[PDB]
Amino acid sequence: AQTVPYGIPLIKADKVQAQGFKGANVKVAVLDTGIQASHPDLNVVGGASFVAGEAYNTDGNGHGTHVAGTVAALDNTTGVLGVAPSVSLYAVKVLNSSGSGSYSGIVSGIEWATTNGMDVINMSLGGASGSTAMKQAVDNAYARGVVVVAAAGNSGNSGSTNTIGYPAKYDSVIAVGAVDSNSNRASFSSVGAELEVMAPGAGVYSTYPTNTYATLNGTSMASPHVAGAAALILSKHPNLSASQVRNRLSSTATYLGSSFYYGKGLINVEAAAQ
Ligand SMILES: [Ca+2]
């Protein structure tokens, strides 16, 4: 009836669930291509779009809907199952259907998130170039107490230079790399000094636009696992601070090898939990 993507158990998300922490009352913003709000396995409570012509609540390129579901695919009897399935899910359309977005849109979405008390902002996007304004709203939202997790980049290596994109590069931002089920670091996952931690990003099955489910690969998929794991935690210790929450994801994870390639390693939600 319901399937459990090999990733919820991998990060021991499901052991937190058992205890009864699933992110109830936790507000997660997914800054993506949008979310098919009519998807039987998802319940989007609100949002916004800064993409022109595109309304939001509709997904032209299956990504937003896929990332959305990893975070909150409802806990029912069908489809899949998200990380923090009780969570208040807001979709911020920041990628115009062909998958790309301009900073103006990104920074706006970020701002929106902060201005609407979003406890979590998931950015499964990037660029190899930054901007002054992005660094400010990522720093600003975090100083504001939001937890900002962003995908690392789907660059592999680039010598021994950082292949981590933006905004993941902003140390106010948690850069998430991708592993698989044998906790092996995905091939395409980005390396750099900024990598923070790893999450499942290979062959991750989730909600796909028009009430169906599919398997995609990427850091883009790695990032949301981290965005839910914090909601869970935020649902157990609702007093904690962003940094309070980060440290725990950080300094309490599973060692896979060098920081360059794996960061602090694979997240452990249970241990981080408390
Ligand atoms: Ca479900």
SS3 per-residue string spanning 178-218: EECCCCCECCCCCCCCCEEEEEECCCEEEEECCCEEEEECC
Torsion (CA) 10, 24, 27, 213 in degrees, nearest 10: 50
Q: How many domains does the chain have?
A: 1
How far is the C-alpha of 163 from the C-alpha of 141, rounded, in Å? Answer: 25
* 12 token code pair: 């021991």
Strands (E), the chain: 27-32, 44-49, 88-93, 120-123, 147-151, 174-179, 195-200, 204-208, 212-216
Distance CA(176)–CA(197), nearest Å, equals 5
* Binding site listing for Ca(2+): 2, 41, 74, 76, 78, 80, 168, 170, 173
**Which residues are 207's β-sheet partners?**
213
Tell how far CA 187 is from the center of its chain: 19
Q: Which candidate in 206, 220, 223, 235 is catalytic?
A: 220
106: domain range?
1-274
Expressed in angstroms and rounded, the spacing between residue 84 Cα and the centre of ligand 1 is 12
Element (H, E) at 139: helix 132-143
Resolution (A): 2.5
Question: What is the domain-level CATH number for residue 270?
Answer: 3.40.50.200
160 is an active site residue: no
Catalytic residue check, 225: no
Signed CA dihedral, 19, 236, 200, 248: sign only = negative
Experimental method: X-ray
Binding site membership: which residues?
2, 41, 74, 76, 78, 80, 168, 170, 173
Contact 126, 153 (CB under 8 A): yes
Q: Is the Cβ–Cβ distance between 230 and 147 less than 8 Å? A: yes
Strands 212-216 and 204-208: antiparallel
What single DSSP character describes residue 6?
A: T
Give the distance (Å) from ligand 1 centre to CA of residue 79. 5
